Amino acid sequence: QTLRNLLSKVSPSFSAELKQLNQQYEKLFHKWMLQLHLGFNIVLYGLGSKRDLLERFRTTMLQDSIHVVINGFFPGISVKSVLNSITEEVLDHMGTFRSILDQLDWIVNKFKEDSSLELFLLIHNLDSQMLRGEKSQQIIGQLSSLHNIYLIASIDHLNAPLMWDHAKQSLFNWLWYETTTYSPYTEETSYENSSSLTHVLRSLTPNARGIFRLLIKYQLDNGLSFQDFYQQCREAFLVNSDLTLRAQLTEFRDHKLLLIPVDNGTLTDFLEK
Amino acid sequence: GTCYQQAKLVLNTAVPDRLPAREREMDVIRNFLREHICSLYLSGAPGTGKTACLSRILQDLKKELKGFKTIMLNCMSLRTAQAVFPAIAQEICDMMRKLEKHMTAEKGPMIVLVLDEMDQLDSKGQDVLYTLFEWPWLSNSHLVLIGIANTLDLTDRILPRLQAREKCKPQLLNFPPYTRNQIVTILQDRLNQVQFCARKVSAVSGDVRKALDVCRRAIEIVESDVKSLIHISQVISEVDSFPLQQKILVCSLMLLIRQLKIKEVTLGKLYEAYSKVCRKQQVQSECLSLSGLLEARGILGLKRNKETRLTKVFFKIEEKEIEHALKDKALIGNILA
Amino acid sequence: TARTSPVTARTLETLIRLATAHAKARMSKTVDLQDAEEAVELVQYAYFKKSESRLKAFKVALLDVFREAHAQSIGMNRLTESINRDSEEPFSSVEIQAALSKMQDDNQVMVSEGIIFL
């Protein structure tokens, strides 16, 4: 999958229609801002990567106000991290919190006491694996229930409507907009995690390399019993005592290398290489 | 007598003034550092002297070049991975922001940070390593970071994202194990006032420290004999009477594994077989104690399942070696018959 | 290649009979080599349808010697006697030493002062 890094040389097709499509999409920003500012939260749904449109909207209209961007497609994001970021910067508070619910209570009380605070949220790929928790969406909806917070979200998964319940629907107060941009999902697939054997075996002792080669050969022929494997290793004179063979087996185990959990085709290609 | 003492002293594990047979790696490191003074990852097997050679070359660069600050840190001295953040700051003078602001300064001497045994800096999310590797590629960065590791998969398991972004790939250098000729050259360099030991060390592990220990032990045995090939092989074979009840127990267990063919035998059946054999030759706490004692010698292995009956027993020695360890065939025949 | 018919004792009878027929083809009295060769070629066509041994013997003998001793050191007299006793051919010393040198380059066998160690 390393070849992916070199695959970016392919040129796009029919880019003129995409240009007109983006120009048509650009004109809805004022209406979206008006709908946000009256107490509505907006979801964007449609085919194609819509990150570019959101970034354009931010850099065009949100350069004069406080705004927080969370690109949830990163698999390391959690709601507690968002809460900590809000507390540390929006309110500039450093004190730790005993529980998530207590942090939510503090934030709600602070925002209710201070009516001069306005915050904008820009969430990318709200359907992330880490944000699908019921408590996560409950927390986000409770946050969005305030009249001093504006929410723009994006949907890219098919089963998104199952996330929201009737009470959650009432809390979120959603409006929908269809914006299909046809953009490739380069960045959003970049962080996602869908050679090693050669590098490991390069610096290992040649006896271990031969033993592993024999093990691969037997595995491709048809798991070995310990006794038969020891006898065959004896026959090749790569082992002088069973303690040494078990030491080599433990060395292989330490690298997570009896069955080898490696695909047959990869082993066949590696043997000749 | 002083000759033996001097030979033992020279062959110690202390870092020497010169490390021969590693001139290629040392030259590569020197060229890299001189290019980056006017991100490196060393990976190697234990006993390759990576720490020693890096310390020697860093001392040489300190002697020859000026205008840089070099900071050593050992990861084992830190109980927590996150504790790497203060330990670095204490060596230069929210804390990570202070480190970044001190590192991105427009004017400032170059900083060469080396963290020995990088593999100990693992995290539940690998965040610390990611930040450390992304530091040298920020704006106005003056960082040359060197990471020493024994694990070969740190650049593979831990850093897929650095492979995703081409600009953040460090330069990797691997230390091959010492060959027989290299070991012989090092040994003759130590004694300016052999082949068999070097061959065995290279074939087993290639660890120069192991060869030094072997020759030290050989010198110790030679000097002990005087005060009162053969020595080297003797020591290496050394490193590389049983109670009668224990003999009866192990013979009974061998009979059981031959008879019922199972790999592991329950303690109750083993005790029953032991009692039957004792009745044949007219000879449970004692049995369990003997099993534990046998496990102490390393003859038998016990999978302990928190109960007397659930503790399972297995062998560790080939049958032929077991038979030849016995010096009497009369007992063997009597137990077999 | 697979076989169309099983090979039994009757195949030898068939070979003899085909040789006799081919000898009958040309006026003669005796059976010649090509007479049997023609029948053999016919049988080959009809029936079927679509050093190193030195090294192997040396290794087998070494295995037998070393785990008939159950020790890592073996006396030279017993070595030679057992190697040249169970083998039909007492092997040449020069080629034995060449094999020993090749295995030494393989780091499998070391000979020192007439004693062999693995």
d(CA B162, CA B134): 9
Phi/psi at B176 (5° precision): -70, 155
C-beta separation of C18 from C31 below 8 A: no
**Structure tokens of B127?**
């965040």
Which chain A residues have a beta carbon less than 8 Å from that of C118? Answer: 237, 240
Burial per residue of C8-29, b for 16 or more beta-carbon CB atoms within 10 angstroms, e otherwise: eeeeeeeeeebbeebbeeeeee
Length of chain C: 118
Q: Which amino acid is at A2?
A: T
Q: Do A205 and B318 touch (CB under 8 A)?
A: no
C2-3/C48-49 β-pairing: antiparallel
Q: Return the sign of the alpha-carbon dihedral for residues B89, B93, B95, B101.
A: negative
Decide if A235 touches C, using CB distance below 8 A.
yes
Q: Do C107 and B199 touch (CB under 8 A)?
A: yes
Decide if B156 touches A, using CB distance below 8 A.
yes
- Name the residue among B296, B323, B305 with its Cα closest to residue B266: B305
Decide if B47 touches A, using CB distance below 8 A.
no
**Structure tokens of A110?**
């602070």
Query: DSSP readout, B131-192?
Result: HHHHGGGSTT--EEEEEEES-S-IIIII-SHHHHSGGGPPEEEEEPPPPHHHHHHHHHHH--
Q: Do B196 and C110 touch (CB under 8 A)?
A: yes
C-beta separation of B215 from B239 below 8 A: no
C-beta separation of A214 from A252 below 8 A: no
Residue B50 assigned ligand-binding role: yes
